[PDB]
Design a protein around this ligand. Structure first.
Ligand SMILES: Nc1ncnc2c1ncn2[C@@H]1O[C@H](COP(=O)(O)OP(=O)(O)OP(=O)(O)O)[C@@H](O)[C@H]1O
Ligand SMILES: N[C@@H](CCC(=O)O)C(=O)O
Ligand SMILES: [Mg+2]
Lengths: 13, 17, 15, 274
């Protein structure tokens, strides 16, 4: 989660 | 392109599942 | 402040 | 409107309001109609010089989305600050020239990116070379797209930091016949158009329409709004260029003005003998 909350929409891509 | 659209429309609570 | 952002969509944040 | 017969060099001007509609989105509806009308005019033997504006809005919108895509969720916590005082402008001018090309490559009319600063102007020997260049470019049936470079400037006299005045100066320098100032409203009213007290006028008399023109209780400032527009028009008229202010949310109007159908407001140096 923290990773998800500390990620870039570009990263999420 | 469709993956981009899906990610643009998704809700953060949906990026976990 | 938090919950909204959590459930909102990247598009939405662009309002 | 008798001058409409003998005009073969016009300087139209689309303001940011005309170009952009919602959320830094090019008004494809308005811009397309205006470009189509300009292409039809060009074909009918008319030197059409286009002075456009709206790069700042497009740059602001695209740099917004280029922040949120490259932002961390934590960042989304606090409303982001100003994007920039000049970079939005840069990106937006790029985008606008891009659009124009794409559109003018459908009706086969070539355009050139001529960007001029206030310092470049006022430089002796510049007010000429620009002149000659623009003349040759018009001669090969090309439509220039003038603008004010807001990305390499240092202002943060001469041009009035507005394309509207830029239009005026260029028109006087390039020795144009007419300068059109397409805007959102149907012309120069007697104040704010919302209330019924303000009434549209059709000719700007020097000593008549300078007592009931507040330019809105609202002072635009950013684009100088109307006051600036009226000033530009007056200056252009005085130098020897008739100037007409008209709505731009309807391109068809341009043909009516050029053909002569009593539409808009006239800022003519022949006010006494009219
Ligand atoms: N005296 C007036 N009569 C009619 N409308 C007015 C008056 N004063 C202010 N306004 C309003 O303010 C606005 C001023 O428009 P403005 O000239 O700033 O747009 P613009 O030409 O796109 O500016 P720019 O291109 O420099 O960004 C008009 O849309 C008009 O509705
Ligand atoms: N900065 C905008 C125009 C600024 C203005 O409204 O005059 C551009 O370069 O296109
Ligand atoms: Mg203005």
């Amino acid at each position: 989660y923290r990773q998800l909350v500390n990620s870039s929409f570009a990263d999420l891509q």
